[PDB]
C-alpha cells in the first residue's frame, strides 16, 4: 500500500543473514518442511490445543527422524529382494519391524483409506 519496504537483506552478512527475531529461523541446513502436515493433523487430534514455534522446530525434527528410521528398513528389505525401489511390500514390513503389531495394523488401515480417497494427506 503506499509506503513500501525501504531495506532489503541482500548484502554482506555478519551473523547468519543478520537475522534478529524478524524472519523464520533458518539454520542447521533445514530445508522445507512437514509443518503443513503436523499443523493439519494436530487440529484433527487436538483442536483446542496449539503449539509454540520452538516446539514445532523440534517436533518436525523428531517426527521426521521416525520416518527416516523406517526408511532404513525399507532399504534393508529391498536389499534382500536385490532391488532399489520402495513399494507397499517394504513399507508394510518396515512398519511391522519397528512399530508394534497392535499399532502397525492401524497404519495399514489408514494407508488403505488414503489410496481409496486418493488423497496424499488427511
Amino acid at each position: 500500500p503506499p509506503k513500501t519496504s525501504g531495506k532489503a537483506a541482500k548484502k554482506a552478512g555478519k551473523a547468519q543473514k543478520n537475522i534478529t527475531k524478524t524472519d523464520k529461523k533458518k539454520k542447521r541446513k533445514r530445508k522445507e518442511s512437514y509443518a503443513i502436515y503436523i499443523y493439519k493433523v494436530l487440529k484433527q487430534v487436538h483442536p483446542d490445543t496449539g503449539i509454540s514455534s520452538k516446539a514445532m522446530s523440534i517436533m518436525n525434527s523428531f517426527v521426521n527422524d521416525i520416518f527416516e528410521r523406517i526408511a532404513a528398513e525399507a532399504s534393508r528389505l529391498a536389499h534382500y529382494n536385490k532391488r532399489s525401489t520402495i513399494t507397499s511390500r517394504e513399507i508394510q514390513t518396515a512398519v511391522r519391524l519397528l512399530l508394534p503389531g497392535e499399532l502397525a495394523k492401524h497404519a495399514v488401515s489408514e494407508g488403505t483409506k488414503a489410496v481409496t480417497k486418493y488423497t496424499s494427506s488427511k
Binding site: 509443518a35 503436523i38 493433523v41 496449539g50 532399504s75 532399489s84 525401489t85 507397499s88 494427506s121
Partner: protein
Amino acid sequence: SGRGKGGKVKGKAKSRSNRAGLQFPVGRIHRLLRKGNYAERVGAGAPVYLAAVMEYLAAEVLELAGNAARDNKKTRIIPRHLQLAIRNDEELNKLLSGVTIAQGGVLPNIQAVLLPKKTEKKA
C-alpha cells in the same frame, strides 16, 4: 514494475509449475532417498501409503504431546514436553533410536548384540 503492477504477479515466480507451500514433490523425495542411499525409485501408490504412515505416526505423537500440554495447563505445547514427556514414551523412543546404546531388542544385524558366546582365545 516501476510504474505499478502492469501484469499479474502472484507467487514467487512465473511458471505454471509452481510449489505453493513447503511440500515435498516426488522429485525431491527421490533426491532425498538417493542422497541417503535408501532407494532410487518409488512404486506407484507407495507415496500415498508413505504419507498415511507419516500422518499416523504424527497423530500418535501429537496425541501424547497435546495431552501432556493440557496437564500442565498450557494452551500451546512447549519444548519442555518434547524433552520430557516425549522422551518418556518407549514406543516413540524406540523408533527415534538407531544402533547405539541398545534400548529395545530391535538391532538389525547378524546375531544378538551381546553375542551368544565368547570368542576363541589363543594360547
